[PDB]
Design a protein around this ligand. Structure first.
Ligand SMILES: [Cl-]
Length: 108
């Protein structure tokens, strides 16, 4: 509708990744979420929206998918977790750890 091939690549990224963090390189919230997953020994796919060509168009399409306008924007095992606050809440509640343990198939 905006960019059909971009929409498709973003979805494919989420579908194939145990964790995908849509981030910005300089953002301390992004930095904080990355550190959380690193502490848990979890490898993540990170897409730095400030470092991709047409990152504005990517954020726009990503808001269409997720109904969220801010970064960071976190998916775990294909489930939208949300922003930094929601990810730390998921950590505190046990949600994050249970989502991370679920069996899934990751292509590549
Ligand atoms: Cl650009």
């Amino acid at each position: 509708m905006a960019r059909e091939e971009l929409r498709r690549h973003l979805v494919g990224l989420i579908e194939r990744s145990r964790v995908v963090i849509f981030s910005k390189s300089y953002c301390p919230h992004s930095t904080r979420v990355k550190e959380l997953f690193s502490s848990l020994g979890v490898e993540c796919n990170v897409l730095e929206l400030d470092q991709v060509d047409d990152g504005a168009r990517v954020q726009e399409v990503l808001s269409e998918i997720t109904n969220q306008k801010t970064v960071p924007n976190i998916f775990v095992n294909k489930v939208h977790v949300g922003g930094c606050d929601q990810t730390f809440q998921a950590y505190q509640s046990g949600l994050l750890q249970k989502l991370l343990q679920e069996d899934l198939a990751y292509d590549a």
